[PDB]
Amino acid sequence: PNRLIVDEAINEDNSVVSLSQPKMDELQLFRGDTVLLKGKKRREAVCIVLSDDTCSDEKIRMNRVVRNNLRVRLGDVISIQPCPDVKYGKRIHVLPIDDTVEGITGNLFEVYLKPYFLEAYRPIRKGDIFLVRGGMRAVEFKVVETDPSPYCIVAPDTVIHCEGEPIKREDEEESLNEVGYDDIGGCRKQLAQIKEMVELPLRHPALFKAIGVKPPRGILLYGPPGTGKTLIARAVANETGAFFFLINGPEIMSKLAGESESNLRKAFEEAEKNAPAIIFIDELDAIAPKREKTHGEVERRIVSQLLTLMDGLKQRAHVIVMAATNRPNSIDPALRRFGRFDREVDIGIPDATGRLEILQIHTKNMKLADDVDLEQVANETHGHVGADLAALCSEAALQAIRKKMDLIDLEDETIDAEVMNSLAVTMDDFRWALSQSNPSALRETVVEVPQVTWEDIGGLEDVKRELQELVQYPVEHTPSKGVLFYGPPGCGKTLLAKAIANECQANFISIKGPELLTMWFGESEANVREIFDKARQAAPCVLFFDELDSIAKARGGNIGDGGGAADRVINQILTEMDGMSTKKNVFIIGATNRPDIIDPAILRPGRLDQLIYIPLPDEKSRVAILKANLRKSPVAKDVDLEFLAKMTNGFSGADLTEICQRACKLAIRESIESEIVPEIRRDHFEEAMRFARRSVSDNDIRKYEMFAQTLQ
Amino acid sequence: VYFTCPLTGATLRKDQRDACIKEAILLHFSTDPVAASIMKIYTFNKDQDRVKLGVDTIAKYLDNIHLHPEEEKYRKIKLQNKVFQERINCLEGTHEFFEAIGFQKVLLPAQDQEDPEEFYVLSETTLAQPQSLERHKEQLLAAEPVRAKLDRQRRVFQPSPLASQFELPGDFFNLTAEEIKREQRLRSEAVERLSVLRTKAMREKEEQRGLRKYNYTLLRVRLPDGCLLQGTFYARERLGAVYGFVREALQSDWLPFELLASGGQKLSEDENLALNECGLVPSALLTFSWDMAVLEDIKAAGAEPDSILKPELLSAIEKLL
Ligand SMILES: Nc1ncnc2c1ncn2[C@@H]1O[C@H](COP(=O)(O)OP(=O)(O)O)[C@@H](O)[C@H]1O
Ligand SMILES: Nc1ncnc2c1ncn2[C@@H]1O[C@H](COP(=O)(O)OP(=O)(O)O)[C@@H](O)[C@H]1O
């Protein structure tokens, strides 16, 4: 009773914890009340309690600084004891930790302690360690004396003292700058999967020691370099307390025969002695390359040695081995057999949201100017991984440093804290760094949730509902797992597939004609399996195969070669679809502009069983299309969009967009010419109307109508 | 939460408010039928926008006969009129008001139908003196719904050091198999929820489950002198009512001060912001501090500010346990 399980914080502040409101009501404490937390080794910490909409009813959310003061870790239990008697302090003596005050000097109070405590009313207890960030440094302090005891609230009238040599860290105290879970940005889902597999046997070893059931023996982390494969492995070890042993290919391969295998098996022996422990083997493809790809005896032996050491994990209780690779197929398949590394996680490439969070992590200690917009940066840094965003922030810092240091002229071993305090990184420094940074993951496919929403699609009210029913039905109540779109081009086929992914917060995988043609021309149709494998790893996702007839057209379309409607690539797609279940949370969508030449197999039961016709928009839809296209621009009141819609009777949605974009182009030119008008006027639309034409003829519409009536 | 009924003086709970006020209004008909029906129209009907339209349409019928008191065409108000049916007939207490101010409910032949229609017809006794209806019109239009007044229940408490004295059992930190299975099941369910492909409507059905618990709040204020000041507010109450509450509790109600919220945001007395908008609901502690201008003069003069609250409240201070 009155005890909760320790969970991760949402509010990063070091003086506050968050409870679920029902427990604050049972404990009869209010938001902002000061409470004590009772941890292990008869230690306690004092903090303020708030609440949010995400904390579990039976958990307490506290950050790393609070957990370390209590000597507790995620998954442990602490007691909550309100202490309304806490009084305001009169004098508190705070000294920094020596491990973080190196290379920095000057008045630390004015830079760190003063703004940290000033009007903050943070509870403080003697012996507390807390972290104050700023000046591109993370400096933590320990409280050595309090006039009231054993805790108090700092007030504006409280004397803050700081005199004496920095404190040497105690052997039982961990540094607050170590890697933890709060240093991982995107790929939260993948981290959650690792937690499920790894934290249990390490935090609760008795569950597997008392019985014959073994935990997972190893996890293979794969994806582009710089995405957090090693960051996750280190964060998990540091948060759970398991001993972390670092191994990598080059370290073992650089050794001579005998020494190499000895070092590999020695690390495994040390992990058992220091169990619980995690062994992280980086560059798995380098230490254990495919046998058929090497001729040396050393490489063949080291693979056999690793295979035997992994099997020995049945006796090495509480030792888990993790490894990193670029791709699951870059390593000797023996490691991926039942046991060993039979479980793998796809880290992928951070999306726009993840990239923003990664930037915010690297700026924890950075002073930003008011003009800095990290969301705008995250949107522009397409193809970048966390390793590149780390370099991006560092380069922006270095540019800001050079600009000021040229005028500061401070040549010494240390920098006065006030000098760093006044240094800020502005948008011109991130803009410069962006021009110098080059993404390391530009060739790999980037899969994320699309930004196209239902408000961007004019008309098609019934198709929108149909797609929502197809995705919602298997969740609210063999259901179909895919739909083919057919009809005139430029009416929203792609937008519909993206919009349903958007609303579901599902990943969107876009396969275009050139990709299907590349596989066909290069006789590499086997790569289709990799596409479907990504769809599984990306789940929930929408797997969109555009231009399904691109190959049929490449083979003649209207004339034709020696084959039929089927080809090498569609045959692989048809085969792979048969292996995907409705419970994989993957919705497959196709599109074609020439159904008369599509392999009919794709519409056979179990595949793209749904078939939706997307006609040219009617009058009310064309008005909606024009309004949607212009939602991002100023439009004058004299622009009659309904009049335009009445004239553009044969226009597709894409053709109405050309009119809007032409009017935008004309408005821009006029504004530029006047400067060397601020809104799009009717004259700009009337001029655009003189050039825009319908792209789909009446004969092409009849072709689609006849097909629709042929299938019914 | 406790309230006082303005028509009886009784102490009520949040659920007992309508039952006591409605009864007092229905009994009031024995003293002043017009005043009782006016309270009934505004108090019984929850939809105040319709009440405002109803009483405005009634006021027009009364002014119509006032303009042409000698013409029989303005003496009868048809209960089946489109405007009467929508604005007046839909409200409870409007028929009682008409009877109270001299209108009789009768059936008259229609100008184009055999079936008699319902009319409110003004009697000669009241028609002879239009001043009576003119006063009754103003009494209805100037009225408000009757609601029980929220009792602030102003209290001051003295925290006791004994409240935080607790020692844990030796086996406190020894977690059970049932606690481990629940946590591992929540981990497996969290990964599964992240994997599910579902629409926004299905997401809302789950998220929306946390939105309806509270409509009142209890606020506490931590004072420099070690006293805790507490009181009760509506969740929609404005921050200006909290500053007024504290000013009344202070020994010197005129001495400028600030109230700092639990999230680090200072509360502005002159800002029309609700407690459920600034994050002080269902409950919160505020930090009290005097304005710096007066603190400089108080300290410079050698005066220790050792009393924050008025002796009138401190004489009733309760200890916390
Ligand atoms: N997903 C991520 N979130 C946060 N930081 C990341 C992420 N991925 C990479 N980084 C950053 O990039 C660097 C990763 O370098 P390293 O430790 O060699 O790991 P790896 O090469 O396995 O990605 C670190 O500075 C880390 O903070
Ligand atoms: N229904 C629609 N509503 C709004 N805009 C549309 C619509 N259909 C097409 N467009 C416009 O046409 C452009 C191309 O749409 P897209 O879906 O890519 O066509 P397709 O699927 O034929 O390649 C979009 O940028 C959009 O502005």
mmCIF file of N, CA, C and O in Angstrom, chain A residues 453-523:
data_model
loop_
_atom_site.group_PDB
_atom_site.id
_atom_site.type_symbol
_atom_site.label_atom_id
_atom_site.label_comp_id
_atom_site.label_asym_id
_atom_site.label_seq_id
_atom_site.Cartn_x
_atom_site.Cartn_y
_atom_site.Cartn_z
ATOM 1 N N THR A 453 -3.373 14.218 -45.504
ATOM 2 C CA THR A 453 -4.531 13.936 -44.673
ATOM 3 C C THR A 453 -5.774 14.023 -45.550
ATOM 4 O O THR A 453 -5.685 14.316 -46.746
ATOM 5 N N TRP A 454 -6.945 13.702 -44.996
ATOM 6 C CA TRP A 454 -8.203 13.700 -45.736
ATOM 7 C C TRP A 454 -8.616 15.095 -46.180
ATOM 8 O O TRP A 454 -9.278 15.227 -47.206
ATOM 9 N N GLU A 455 -8.206 16.140 -45.455
ATOM 10 C CA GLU A 455 -8.531 17.503 -45.850
ATOM 11 C C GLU A 455 -7.847 17.909 -47.148
ATOM 12 O O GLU A 455 -8.228 18.924 -47.743
ATOM 13 N N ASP A 456 -6.850 17.146 -47.595
ATOM 14 C CA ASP A 456 -6.135 17.477 -48.822
ATOM 15 C C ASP A 456 -6.770 16.857 -50.058
ATOM 16 O O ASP A 456 -6.299 17.113 -51.169
ATOM 17 N N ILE A 457 -7.813 16.051 -49.893
ATOM 18 C CA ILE A 457 -8.433 15.339 -51.003
ATOM 19 C C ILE A 457 -9.841 15.879 -51.199
ATOM 20 O O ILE A 457 -10.687 15.774 -50.306
ATOM 21 N N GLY A 458 -10.093 16.471 -52.365
ATOM 22 C CA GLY A 458 -11.415 16.981 -52.672
ATOM 23 C C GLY A 458 -12.319 15.871 -53.170
ATOM 24 O O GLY A 458 -11.878 14.973 -53.893
ATOM 25 N N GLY A 459 -13.591 15.935 -52.788
ATOM 26 C CA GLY A 459 -14.551 14.957 -53.260
ATOM 27 C C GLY A 459 -14.291 13.579 -52.675
ATOM 28 O O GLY A 459 -13.677 13.431 -51.617
ATOM 29 N N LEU A 460 -14.777 12.560 -53.380
ATOM 30 C CA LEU A 460 -14.603 11.156 -53.006
ATOM 31 C C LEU A 460 -15.053 10.865 -51.580
ATOM 32 O O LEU A 460 -14.379 10.125 -50.860
ATOM 33 N N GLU A 461 -16.190 11.421 -51.156
ATOM 34 C CA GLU A 461 -16.639 11.223 -49.778
ATOM 35 C C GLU A 461 -16.888 9.749 -49.479
ATOM 36 O O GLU A 461 -16.616 9.280 -48.366
ATOM 37 N N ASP A 462 -17.405 9.001 -50.457
ATOM 38 C CA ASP A 462 -17.728 7.601 -50.219
ATOM 39 C C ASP A 462 -16.479 6.733 -50.199
ATOM 40 O O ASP A 462 -16.405 5.779 -49.422
ATOM 41 N N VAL A 463 -15.486 7.052 -51.033
ATOM 42 C CA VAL A 463 -14.243 6.293 -51.026
ATOM 43 C C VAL A 463 -13.516 6.475 -49.699
ATOM 44 O O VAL A 463 -12.932 5.528 -49.162
ATOM 45 N N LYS A 464 -13.531 7.693 -49.151
ATOM 46 C CA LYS A 464 -12.922 7.913 -47.842
ATOM 47 C C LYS A 464 -13.541 7.007 -46.789
ATOM 48 O O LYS A 464 -12.826 6.384 -45.994
ATOM 49 N N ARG A 465 -14.872 6.918 -46.768
ATOM 50 C CA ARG A 465 -15.541 6.064 -45.791
ATOM 51 C C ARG A 465 -15.194 4.595 -46.021
ATOM 52 O O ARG A 465 -14.971 3.841 -45.068
ATOM 53 N N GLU A 466 -15.143 4.179 -47.287
ATOM 54 C CA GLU A 466 -14.848 2.783 -47.605
ATOM 55 C C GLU A 466 -13.485 2.367 -47.073
ATOM 56 O O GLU A 466 -13.338 1.287 -46.492
ATOM 57 N N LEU A 467 -12.470 3.213 -47.265
ATOM 58 C CA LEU A 467 -11.138 2.901 -46.762
ATOM 59 C C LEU A 467 -11.117 2.856 -45.240
ATOM 60 O O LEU A 467 -10.424 2.020 -44.649
ATOM 61 N N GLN A 468 -11.823 3.764 -44.567
ATOM 62 C CA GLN A 468 -11.894 3.728 -43.112
ATOM 63 C C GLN A 468 -12.580 2.450 -42.640
ATOM 64 O O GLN A 468 -12.162 1.851 -41.649
ATOM 65 N N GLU A 469 -13.612 1.985 -43.352
ATOM 66 C CA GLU A 469 -14.272 0.743 -42.962
ATOM 67 C C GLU A 469 -13.361 -0.459 -43.160
ATOM 68 O O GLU A 469 -13.322 -1.366 -42.321
ATOM 69 N N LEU A 470 -12.618 -0.486 -44.268
ATOM 70 C CA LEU A 470 -11.728 -1.611 -44.537
ATOM 71 C C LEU A 470 -10.647 -1.763 -43.472
ATOM 72 O O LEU A 470 -10.319 -2.889 -43.087
ATOM 73 N N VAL A 471 -10.089 -0.658 -42.986
ATOM 74 C CA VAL A 471 -9.114 -0.713 -41.908
ATOM 75 C C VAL A 471 -9.745 -0.873 -40.531
ATOM 76 O O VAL A 471 -9.189 -1.605 -39.695
ATOM 77 N N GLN A 472 -10.876 -0.214 -40.250
ATOM 78 C CA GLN A 472 -11.500 -0.299 -38.918
ATOM 79 C C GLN A 472 -12.224 -1.626 -38.668
ATOM 80 O O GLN A 472 -12.169 -2.165 -37.572
ATOM 81 N N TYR A 473 -12.881 -2.207 -39.665
ATOM 82 C CA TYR A 473 -13.631 -3.442 -39.454
ATOM 83 C C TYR A 473 -12.823 -4.558 -38.798
ATOM 84 O O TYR A 473 -13.300 -5.106 -37.791
ATOM 85 N N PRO A 474 -11.643 -4.949 -39.290
ATOM 86 C CA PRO A 474 -10.901 -6.032 -38.615
ATOM 87 C C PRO A 474 -10.431 -5.674 -37.217
ATOM 88 O O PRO A 474 -10.001 -6.572 -36.481
ATOM 89 N N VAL A 475 -10.499 -4.405 -36.819
ATOM 90 C CA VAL A 475 -10.121 -4.007 -35.474
ATOM 91 C C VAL A 475 -11.322 -3.882 -34.541
ATOM 92 O O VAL A 475 -11.235 -4.306 -33.383
ATOM 93 N N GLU A 476 -12.445 -3.322 -34.985
ATOM 94 C CA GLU A 476 -13.633 -3.181 -34.146
ATOM 95 C C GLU A 476 -14.417 -4.494 -34.027
ATOM 96 O O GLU A 476 -14.888 -4.788 -32.929
ATOM 97 N N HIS A 477 -14.516 -5.321 -35.086
ATOM 98 C CA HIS A 477 -15.333 -6.529 -35.036
ATOM 99 C C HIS A 477 -14.474 -7.767 -34.802
ATOM 100 O O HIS A 477 -14.521 -8.709 -35.606
ATOM 101 N N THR A 478 -12.307 -14.386 -43.714
ATOM 102 C CA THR A 478 -11.066 -13.631 -43.768
ATOM 103 C C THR A 478 -11.339 -12.247 -44.349
ATOM 104 O O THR A 478 -11.764 -12.145 -45.506
ATOM 105 N N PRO A 479 -11.162 -11.176 -43.581
ATOM 106 C CA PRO A 479 -11.323 -9.832 -44.150
ATOM 107 C C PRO A 479 -10.294 -9.566 -45.240
ATOM 108 O O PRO A 479 -9.180 -10.092 -45.218
ATOM 109 N N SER A 480 -10.686 -8.741 -46.209
ATOM 110 C CA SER A 480 -9.770 -8.345 -47.263
ATOM 111 C C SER A 480 -8.623 -7.525 -46.684
ATOM 112 O O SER A 480 -8.805 -6.712 -45.777
ATOM 113 N N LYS A 481 -7.428 -7.752 -47.220
ATOM 114 C CA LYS A 481 -6.245 -7.013 -46.811
ATOM 115 C C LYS A 481 -5.658 -6.135 -47.910
ATOM 116 O O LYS A 481 -4.479 -5.780 -47.824
ATOM 117 N N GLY A 482 -6.441 -5.770 -48.919
ATOM 118 C CA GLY A 482 -5.932 -4.907 -49.969
ATOM 119 C C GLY A 482 -7.019 -4.480 -50.927
ATOM 120 O O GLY A 482 -8.074 -5.116 -51.034
ATOM 121 N N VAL A 483 -6.723 -3.404 -51.654
ATOM 122 C CA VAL A 483 -7.636 -2.808 -52.618
ATOM 123 C C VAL A 483 -6.829 -2.322 -53.812
ATOM 124 O O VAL A 483 -5.698 -1.848 -53.657
ATOM 125 N N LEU A 484 -7.406 -2.450 -55.000
ATOM 126 C CA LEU A 484 -6.845 -1.885 -56.223
ATOM 127 C C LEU A 484 -7.658 -0.655 -56.596
ATOM 128 O O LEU A 484 -8.890 -0.680 -56.539
ATOM 129 N N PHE A 485 -6.968 0.420 -56.968
ATOM 130 C CA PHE A 485 -7.630 1.609 -57.477
ATOM 131 C C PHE A 485 -7.467 1.675 -58.988
ATOM 132 O O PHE A 485 -6.369 1.462 -59.508
ATOM 133 N N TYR A 486 -8.550 1.975 -59.694
ATOM 134 C CA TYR A 486 -8.475 2.131 -61.139
ATOM 135 C C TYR A 486 -9.329 3.318 -61.559
ATOM 136 O O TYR A 486 -10.201 3.776 -60.818
ATOM 137 N N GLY A 487 -9.043 3.828 -62.751
ATOM 138 C CA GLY A 487 -9.763 4.956 -63.287
ATOM 139 C C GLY A 487 -8.824 5.985 -63.876
ATOM 140 O O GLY A 487 -7.619 5.759 -63.999
ATOM 141 N N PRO A 488 -9.365 7.139 -64.256
ATOM 142 C CA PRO A 488 -8.549 8.175 -64.898
ATOM 143 C C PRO A 488 -7.432 8.639 -63.982
ATOM 144 O O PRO A 488 -7.585 8.651 -62.754
ATOM 145 N N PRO A 489 -6.280 9.002 -64.542
ATOM 146 C CA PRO A 489 -5.175 9.496 -63.715
ATOM 147 C C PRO A 489 -5.438 10.888 -63.171
ATOM 148 O O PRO A 489 -6.226 11.661 -63.725
ATOM 149 N N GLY A 490 -4.754 11.206 -62.081
ATOM 150 C CA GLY A 490 -4.809 12.539 -61.504
ATOM 151 C C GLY A 490 -6.054 12.831 -60.701
ATOM 152 O O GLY A 490 -6.452 13.996 -60.589
ATOM 153 N N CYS A 491 -6.686 11.800 -60.137
ATOM 154 C CA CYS A 491 -7.897 11.986 -59.351
ATOM 155 C C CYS A 491 -7.709 11.681 -57.866
ATOM 156 O O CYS A 491 -8.677 11.780 -57.105
ATOM 157 N N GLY A 492 -6.506 11.323 -57.438
ATOM 158 C CA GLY A 492 -6.239 11.076 -56.034
ATOM 159 C C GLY A 492 -5.918 9.652 -55.636
ATOM 160 O O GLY A 492 -5.968 9.346 -54.442
ATOM 161 N N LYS A 493 -5.591 8.773 -56.586
ATOM 162 C CA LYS A 493 -5.267 7.397 -56.227
ATOM 163 C C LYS A 493 -4.185 7.334 -55.155
ATOM 164 O O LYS A 493 -4.350 6.656 -54.132
ATOM 165 N N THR A 494 -3.072 8.043 -55.362
ATOM 166 C CA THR A 494 -1.986 8.011 -54.389
ATOM 167 C C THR A 494 -2.386 8.707 -53.094
ATOM 168 O O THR A 494 -2.045 8.246 -51.997
ATOM 169 N N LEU A 495 -3.104 9.827 -53.203
ATOM 170 C CA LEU A 495 -3.497 10.580 -52.018
ATOM 171 C C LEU A 495 -4.376 9.738 -51.106
ATOM 172 O O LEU A 495 -4.270 9.818 -49.882
ATOM 173 N N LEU A 496 -5.265 8.931 -51.692
ATOM 174 C CA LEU A 496 -6.131 8.076 -50.889
ATOM 175 C C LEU A 496 -5.321 7.074 -50.081
ATOM 176 O O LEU A 496 -5.601 6.844 -48.897
ATOM 177 N N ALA A 497 -4.313 6.460 -50.709
ATOM 178 C CA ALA A 497 -3.474 5.504 -49.996
ATOM 179 C C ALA A 497 -2.677 6.181 -48.886
ATOM 180 O O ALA A 497 -2.488 5.600 -47.811
ATOM 181 N N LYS A 498 -2.197 7.400 -49.130
ATOM 182 C CA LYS A 498 -1.452 8.110 -48.094
ATOM 183 C C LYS A 498 -2.373 8.606 -46.985
ATOM 184 O O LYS A 498 -2.034 8.516 -45.801
ATOM 185 N N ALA A 499 -3.551 9.115 -47.345
ATOM 186 C CA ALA A 499 -4.433 9.719 -46.355
ATOM 187 C C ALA A 499 -4.899 8.703 -45.326
ATOM 188 O O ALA A 499 -5.026 9.023 -44.138
ATOM 189 N N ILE A 500 -5.178 7.470 -45.758
ATOM 190 C CA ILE A 500 -5.589 6.445 -44.805
ATOM 191 C C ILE A 500 -4.427 6.063 -43.892
ATOM 192 O O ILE A 500 -4.624 5.781 -42.706
ATOM 193 N N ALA A 501 -3.207 6.040 -44.427
ATOM 194 C CA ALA A 501 -2.040 5.819 -43.584
ATOM 195 C C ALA A 501 -1.851 6.965 -42.603
ATOM 196 O O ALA A 501 -1.442 6.756 -41.456
ATOM 197 N N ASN A 502 -2.137 8.192 -43.042
ATOM 198 C CA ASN A 502 -1.933 9.356 -42.183
ATOM 199 C C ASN A 502 -2.820 9.290 -40.946
ATOM 200 O O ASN A 502 -2.321 9.296 -39.814
ATOM 201 N N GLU A 503 -4.115 9.174 -41.173
ATOM 202 C CA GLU A 503 -5.101 9.133 -40.115
ATOM 203 C C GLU A 503 -4.859 7.968 -39.138
ATOM 204 O O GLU A 503 -4.905 8.149 -37.924
ATOM 205 N N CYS A 504 -4.448 6.798 -39.633
ATOM 206 C CA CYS A 504 -4.111 5.655 -38.787
ATOM 207 C C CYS A 504 -2.766 5.785 -38.060
ATOM 208 O O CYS A 504 -2.425 4.915 -37.268
ATOM 209 N N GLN A 505 -1.968 6.816 -38.345
ATOM 210 C CA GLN A 505 -0.570 6.970 -37.921
ATOM 211 C C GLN A 505 0.310 5.770 -38.330
ATOM 212 O O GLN A 505 1.177 5.324 -37.580
ATOM 213 N N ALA A 506 0.049 5.234 -39.523
ATOM 214 C CA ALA A 506 0.697 4.068 -40.097
ATOM 215 C C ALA A 506 1.802 4.495 -41.051
ATOM 216 O O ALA A 506 1.726 5.548 -41.692
ATOM 217 N N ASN A 507 2.839 3.670 -41.137
ATOM 218 C CA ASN A 507 3.929 3.948 -42.058
ATOM 219 C C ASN A 507 3.478 3.695 -43.491
ATOM 220 O O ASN A 507 2.691 2.791 -43.774
ATOM 221 N N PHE A 508 3.967 4.525 -44.404
ATOM 222 C CA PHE A 508 3.602 4.420 -45.806
ATOM 223 C C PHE A 508 4.836 4.058 -46.615
ATOM 224 O O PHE A 508 5.834 4.782 -46.587
ATOM 225 N N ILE A 509 4.765 2.936 -47.324
ATOM 226 C CA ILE A 509 5.848 2.462 -48.174
ATOM 227 C C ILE A 509 5.409 2.655 -49.615
ATOM 228 O O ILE A 509 4.421 2.053 -50.053
ATOM 229 N N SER A 510 6.130 3.493 -50.349
ATOM 230 C CA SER A 510 5.743 3.891 -51.694
ATOM 231 C C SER A 510 6.655 3.194 -52.692
ATOM 232 O O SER A 510 7.858 3.470 -52.741
ATOM 233 N N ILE A 511 6.081 2.298 -53.491
ATOM 234 C CA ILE A 511 6.786 1.624 -54.570
ATOM 235 C C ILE A 511 6.263 2.212 -55.868
ATOM 236 O O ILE A 511 5.058 2.155 -56.144
ATOM 237 N N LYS A 512 7.161 2.776 -56.666
ATOM 238 C CA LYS A 512 6.781 3.418 -57.911
ATOM 239 C C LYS A 512 7.235 2.593 -59.111
ATOM 240 O O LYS A 512 8.095 1.719 -59.013
ATOM 241 N N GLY A 513 6.626 2.881 -60.255
ATOM 242 C CA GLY A 513 6.939 2.202 -61.491
ATOM 243 C C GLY A 513 8.417 1.940 -61.711
ATOM 244 O O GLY A 513 8.825 0.801 -61.954
ATOM 245 N N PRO A 514 9.248 2.987 -61.656
ATOM 246 C CA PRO A 514 10.688 2.774 -61.859
ATOM 247 C C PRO A 514 11.283 1.694 -60.972
ATOM 248 O O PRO A 514 12.221 1.018 -61.400
ATOM 249 N N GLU A 515 10.775 1.502 -59.754
ATOM 250 C CA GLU A 515 11.321 0.457 -58.890
ATOM 251 C C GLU A 515 10.911 -0.936 -59.359
ATOM 252 O O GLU A 515 11.736 -1.859 -59.389
ATOM 253 N N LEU A 516 9.644 -1.101 -59.740
ATOM 254 C CA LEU A 516 9.196 -2.371 -60.301
ATOM 255 C C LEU A 516 9.900 -2.659 -61.617
ATOM 256 O O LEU A 516 10.216 -3.811 -61.927
ATOM 257 N N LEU A 517 10.156 -1.619 -62.406
ATOM 258 C CA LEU A 517 10.859 -1.814 -63.671
ATOM 259 C C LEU A 517 12.331 -2.146 -63.443
ATOM 260 O O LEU A 517 12.905 -2.954 -64.176
ATOM 261 N N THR A 518 12.957 -1.522 -62.448
ATOM 262 C CA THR A 518 14.349 -1.828 -62.137
ATOM 263 C C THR A 518 14.517 -3.301 -61.798
ATOM 264 O O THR A 518 15.438 -3.964 -62.285
ATOM 265 N N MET A 519 13.629 -3.831 -60.958
ATOM 266 C CA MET A 519 13.702 -5.252 -60.627
ATOM 267 C C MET A 519 13.488 -6.134 -61.854
ATOM 268 O O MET A 519 14.189 -7.134 -62.021
ATOM 269 N N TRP A 520 12.527 -5.788 -62.708
ATOM 270 C CA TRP A 520 12.294 -6.579 -63.915
ATOM 271 C C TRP A 520 13.491 -6.529 -64.856
ATOM 272 O O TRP A 520 13.997 -7.573 -65.286
ATOM 273 N N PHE A 521 13.952 -5.326 -65.195
ATOM 274 C CA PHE A 521 15.041 -5.186 -66.161
ATOM 275 C C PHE A 521 16.315 -5.846 -65.657
ATOM 276 O O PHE A 521 17.045 -6.480 -66.428
ATOM 277 N N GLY A 522 16.607 -5.712 -64.363
ATOM 278 C CA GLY A 522 17.838 -6.250 -63.826
ATOM 279 C C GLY A 522 17.763 -7.701 -63.418
ATOM 280 O O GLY A 522 18.740 -8.222 -62.872
ATOM 281 N N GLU A 523 16.631 -8.360 -63.673
ATOM 282 C CA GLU A 523 16.422 -9.757 -63.295
ATOM 283 C C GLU A 523 16.710 -9.962 -61.810
ATOM 284 O O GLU A 523 17.385 -10.911 -61.409
#
